[PDB]
Amino acid sequence: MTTINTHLRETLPKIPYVKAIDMYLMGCFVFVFMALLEYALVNYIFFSQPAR
């Protein structure tokens, strides 16, 4: 996701405002980040409680 957004941005001028595809990519990155965060939250509580 990071690389996708970087390279995509490189092809446009240096505009201050967030575009629409930038908003979509930020949303997708938030979803991926939260997915990894949830995995780590499972890993943290897994030894104490195996059903949660």
How many whole angstroms from its chain centre is CA 18? 16
52 part of the interface to another protein, by CB under 8 A: no
Q: CA neighbours within 13 Å on the CB side: how many for 52?
A: 11
Minimal distance in Å, beta carbon 5 to another protein? 11
Task: Please give the residues from 10 up to 49 whose contact with another protein meets the rule CB under 8 A.
Answer: 14
Query: Which residue, 3 or 49, is less far from another protein as judged by CB?
Result: 3
Using DSSP, state whether 25 is helix, strand or coil: helix
Residues at the contact surface with another protein, assessed by CB under 8 A:
2, 6, 14
